[PDB]
Amino acid sequence: DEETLKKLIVRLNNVQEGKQIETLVQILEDLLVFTYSEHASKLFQGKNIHVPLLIVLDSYMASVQQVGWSLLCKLIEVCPGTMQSLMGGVHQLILKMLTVHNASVNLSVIGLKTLDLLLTSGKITLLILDEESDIFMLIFDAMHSFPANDEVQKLGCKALHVLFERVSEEQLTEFVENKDYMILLSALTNFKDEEEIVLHVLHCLHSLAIPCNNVEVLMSGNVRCYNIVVEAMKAFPMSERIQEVSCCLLHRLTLGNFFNILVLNEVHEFVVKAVQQYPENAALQISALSCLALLTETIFLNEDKLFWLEACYKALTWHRKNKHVQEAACWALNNLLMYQNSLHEKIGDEDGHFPAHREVMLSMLMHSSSKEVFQASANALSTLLEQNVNFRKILLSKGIHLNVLELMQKHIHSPEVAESGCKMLNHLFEGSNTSLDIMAAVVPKILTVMKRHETSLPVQLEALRAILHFIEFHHKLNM
Amino acid sequence: ADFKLQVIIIGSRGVGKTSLMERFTDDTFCEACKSTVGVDFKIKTVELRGKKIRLQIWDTAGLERFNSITSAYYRSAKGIILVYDITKKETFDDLPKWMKMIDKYASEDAELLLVGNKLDCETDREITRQQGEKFAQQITGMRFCEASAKDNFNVDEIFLKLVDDILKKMP
Ligand SMILES: Nc1nc2c(ncn2[C@@H]2O[C@H](COP(=O)(O)OP(=O)(O)NP(=O)(O)O)[C@@H](O)[C@H]2O)c(=O)[nH]1
Ligand SMILES: [Mg+2]
C-alpha cells in the first residue's frame, strides 16, 4: 500500500549505492501502470524527489536516466497535479538529458515523448526557448541521425508544430537557411503513407511560410511546395485535418506568383474538391474561398465555371453568424461572376437557379458592424446588378437604398466602404423612376459622403455618376 | 542579402535552358530533363564584388503556347539570356522572334546576353562558331559565349560574367 511508497521515497531520497536505486523506482513504474488506484496522489514524488534523483545521481549514467524519464512521463498522465508543479527544474534538465544521450534511438524516443507530453501546457515552452540549449538544434540532430525510426520522426515534428508557433519572426526566416527545409521535407518522403507525420509536416511548413523572404524559397524549384498537392491527393483524400492544413498553407502561399500555381493544374483542381467535399469546417472555407478568389483571374485566363458557385452559396447559407466566412465567400462569388459572364444566367430567384442575391443582401444587412463584409458585399451586389434588369427591381422595393445609406453614414470615416456603397447606389438605380421623396432623402447623404473624402479618385467618380440619376409638383420641386 | 536581381533565361524549346540553370544553381543533371510546364524559379545566393546577391533565375517555357505568360516577366529582368542549340539550325533562326519579344517587352537597363548550348557536339554543330558574334553585331550589349551543360564547360562563366556586367554599371 502507501507505506511501500513511503519506503520507496525514503530509499530514493538517500543515495548510497548507484545500482540498487534503479530497482526501486522501477517497481514504482509497475505501480505507475497499476491502475488499482491513484495512489500517486500525495504529490511528494515526481516533482521534488525524482528530479534531484534524475539529474544528480545519474546525469550521464542509460542506467537510471531512461527509467527515470520514463517514470516522469508515466506520472504526468495519471497524476495531474504534477503538470502544475513542473514549472511555475524540469526544463533545464531535459535539454541536458537530450544533449548527453545524443546516441540512443531508445533513450531519445522517451525524451521526445516527455517533450511532446510536456509542451502541451504552455509557460514551459517559453522557459525552454529562453536557454543556452537552442532546442531546435537538439531535435533536428535527433531527426538527422535517425532515419527510418517511425517515432523520432514523429514525437518530433509534433514537438516542432507546437514550438514553431511561438519562436520569432527572424529565427523562422533563419531556419530557411537550408535546415528546416531538409529535415522536415525529407520526413515527408520516408513516411509519405503515415498520417500524423504528414499532417505535422504540413503544419510546420505552414508555420514558416509567414515571412515574405520565405514564400519565395518555398514556392521555388529547389524545395517545391507542391507536396501540398500530393498530400491532399494520396495520403489523405478523406480526412479533414490534412485537408484543412494543406489548404490553409495553399492560401498562405499565393503571393504575387500566381502563374506557377494555376498553370500546375493540380493546385486549383484540388482546392475546389476540398471545398465541395467539406462544407462544414469554417477554417477550410475561409482559406479556400479566399485562395480561389485570388487565383480566379489566372484560372479563367487559361464545366470549370460551375466549380465554385454551388460551394459559395452553401458557404453563404450555412455559416451565417461568422464574418470571415461571408467575407471570403462573397469575395469568391463576386470574383467568379466578374470573370465568367455565362453563369450570370445561372444565378437567379427562379426554380433551379440559386437565389444568391437575397443571400448577399441578408449577409450585408446582418453584419452591419464590420467594414470588410460590407466592402466585399457591395462589390458582390455590384456585379450581380450590372448584368441584369430584373434584380434592380426587388432590392429597390425591399428597401435596400435606405439601408445602404445608413450603412455608409455609419462607416463615415472610411473611403473603401464609401466607394463600394456609392458604386452600389450607382448601379442600383440606373433606368428607373424617382419619387421625389427618394431624391430628397438620398441626395443630401451622397453629398455628405462626397465632401468628407475629398481626395479619393473613385469616391467622386462614382458619386458624380450616381447623383446624375436624380437630377403642385413645381411647388415641391422648387423646394 | 544586399541585392536582389531578376535574371531570366529565354529560348526556343529543346536547347537546354533548364540544364544550364541546374548546372549553375544545384549542379544536378539527368539526360531526360522533363520540359518546364511553365515558368519556374531557381533561387541562388552568390557573394561577389563585396556584396551578397540574391539572384533569381526565371526559367521559361519555350513553346508558342506559353509565349504570353512568359511575357509578363520580361520587365523586371535585369539581365536576359537567350539560347540556341548548335545542332538544330531553326533553333537559332527562331532568334528574330525572341529579339522582337525582347524589344517589345524589356526595359532600358536590360543587358541581353546570347549563349550557345551543348558545345560537346561542335564536330556535329549544324550552326558554326563565328555566327554568334556575327549575329551579335547588333546592339553592343549583345555578348556571346558558348558553353555546354552536360560536360560543365564554361557554365558558371555565363552567370558570373553576367552578374559582373550588371552590377559594375548601376550604383
Ligand atoms: N550532351 C548534352 N546534352 C544536353 C545539353 N543540354 C541539354 N542537353 C540534352 O537536351 C535535352 C533538352 O532538354 P531541356 O534541357 O529541358 O531543354 P529545354 O529547351 O530547356 N526544354 P524547356 O525550355 O521546354 O524546359 C536535355 O534533357 C538533355 O538530355 C548539353 O550541354 N550537352
Ligand atoms: Mg528545358
The distance in angstroms from the start CA to the end CA of chain B is 16
Distance CA B105, CA B71 (A): 7
User: What is the Rg, in whole angstroms, of the alpha carbon atoms belonging to chain B?
Assistant: 15
C-alpha cell at B25: 544553381
Residue at A196: amino acid letter: E
C-alpha cell at A245: 492544413
| Residue labelled with grid coordinates 520526413 | A187
Compute φ and ψ for A283, nearest 5 degrees: -65, -35
Please give the DSSP secondary-structure letter assigned to residue B35. Answer: P
Who contacts A317 (Cβ-Cβ below 8 Å, separation ≥6)? A359
Strand B143-144 and strand B51-56: the pairing is unpaired
Do residues A337 and A376 make contact, with C-beta atoms less than 8 angstroms apart? no
Do residues A159 and A139 make contact, with C-beta atoms less than 8 angstroms apart? yes
Do residues A247 and A271 make contact, with C-beta atoms less than 8 angstroms apart? yes
CB atoms within 10 A of CB A262: 22
Distance CA A201, CA A157 (A): 6
Ligand 1 atom index nearest CA of B33: 27
Distance CA A404, CA A392 (A): 14
Please, what's the b/e burial string for A44-59 (b: 16 or more CB within 10 A of its CB; e: otherwise)? ebbbebbbebbbebbe
Please give the DSSP secondary-structure letter assigned to residue A216. Answer: H
Distance CA A232, CA A260 (A): 18
Q: Give how far Cα A181 sits from Cα of A141, A202, A231, A295, A414, Å.
A: 14, 12, 17, 26, 42
Which residues of B41-138 form beta strands (DSSP E)?
Answer: 43-48, 51-56, 58-59, 79-85, 111-117
Do residues B95 and B85 make contact, with C-beta atoms less than 8 angstroms apart? no
- Tell me if chain A has a CB within 8 Å of the CB of B153: no
Distance CA A298, CA A331 (A): 16
Beta-bridge partners for B117: B85
Strand B79-85 and strand B111-117: the pairing is parallel
Kindly identify which residue of chain B lies nearest to residue A262, measuring between CA atoms: B38
Ligand 1 atom index nearest CA of B117: 31
Compute φ and ψ for A367, nearest 5 degrees: -85, 65
Distance CA A302, CA A264 (A): 11
Interface test with B, best of A173, A176, A216 (most B CBs within 10 A): A216
User: What is the Rg, in whole angstroms, of the alpha carbon atoms belonging to chain A?
Assistant: 31
Distance CA A82, CA A47 (A): 7
Do residues A404 and A421 make contact, with C-beta atoms less than 8 angstroms apart? yes
Do residues A372 and A327 make contact, with C-beta atoms less than 8 angstroms apart? yes
Do residues A75 and A85 make contact, with C-beta atoms less than 8 angstroms apart? no
Calculate ∠ Cα A416-A421-A422, nearest 5°: 100
Who contacts B105 (Cβ-Cβ below 8 Å, separation ≥6)? B71, B74, B75
Beta-bridge partners for B46: B53
Strand B3-4: give its sheet, edge to edge: B3-4, B51-56, B43-48
C-alpha cell at A229: 498537392
**3-state DSSP assignment of residue A323:** coil
HSE of A257, CA atoms in CB hemisphere, 13 A: 22
DSSP calls for A405-464: HHHHHHTTT-HHHHHHHHHHHHHHHSS----HHHHHHHHHHHHHTTSS-TT-HHHHHTHH
Distance CA A365, CA A361 (A): 6
Residues 61-90 of B with CB under 8 A from A: 69, 72
Residue A393 Cα to ligand 2 midpoint, Å, equals 57
Best CA proximity match to B157, nearest among B2, B18, B15, B20: B20
Distance CA A426, CA A421 (A): 9
**3-state DSSP assignment of residue B4:** strand
- Tell me if chain A has a CB within 8 Å of the CB of B25: yes
Residue B36 Cα to ligand 2 midpoint, Å, equals 6
**3-state DSSP assignment of residue B117:** strand
| Long-range contacts of A336-341, Cβ-Cβ distance < 8 Å, separation of 24 or more | A336/A293, A336/A296, A336/A305, A336/A308, A336/A309, A336/A312, A337/A380, A337/A383, A337/A384, A337/A387, A338/A383, A339/A296, A339/A297, A339/A300, A340/A300, A340/A305, A341/A387
Strand B111-117: give its sheet, edge to edge: B58-59, B8-11, B79-85, B111-117, B143-144
Best CA proximity match to A422, nearest among A373, A379, A454: A379
Distance CA A49, CA A39 (A): 16
Alpha-carbon torsion B8, B12, B18, B24, what sign?
negative
Do residues A155 and A108 make contact, with C-beta atoms less than 8 angstroms apart? no
Calculate ∠ Cα A106-A108-A114, nearest 5°: 115
Best CA proximity match to B141, nearest among B161, B116, B117: B161
Please give the DSSP secondary-structure letter assigned to residue A259. Answer: T
Beta-bridge partners for B112: B80
Alpha-carbon torsion A69, A152, A284, A370, what sign?
positive
C-alpha cell at A4: 511501500
Distance CA B3, CA A77 (A): 53
Please give the DSSP secondary-structure letter assigned to residue A224. Answer: -
Give the residue numbers of the binding site of B: 14-19, 35-36, 59, 62, 117-118, 120-121, 148-150
**3-state DSSP assignment of residue A368:** coil
Largest CA distance in chain A: 113
Do residues A153 and A144 make contact, with C-beta atoms less than 8 angstroms apart? no
Chain A residues near residue B1 by CB distance under 8 angstroms: 213
Strand B58-59 and strand B143-144: the pairing is unpaired
Kindly identify which residue of chain A lies nearest to residue B4, measuring between CA atoms: A213
Who contacts A49 (Cβ-Cβ below 8 Å, separation ≥6)? A9, A12, A13
**Nominal resolution in Å?**
4.1
Residue B21 Cα to ligand 2 midpoint, Å, equals 9
Chain A residues near residue B56 by CB distance under 8 angstroms: 216
| Residue labelled with grid coordinates 434588369 | A389
Kindly identify which residue of chain B lies nearest to residue A265, measuring between CA atoms: B37
Residue with CA at minimum distance from ligand 1 atom 30: B118
Residue at A312: amino acid letter: C
Best CA proximity match to A191, nearest among A249, A151, A243: A151
Distance CA A139, CA A160 (A): 8
Please judge whether A263 and B40 are an interchain contact, meaning their C-beta atoms are less than 8 angstroms apart. no
Please judge whether A220 and B43 are an interchain contact, meaning their C-beta atoms are less than 8 angstroms apart. yes
Do residues A269 and A232 make contact, with C-beta atoms less than 8 angstroms apart? no
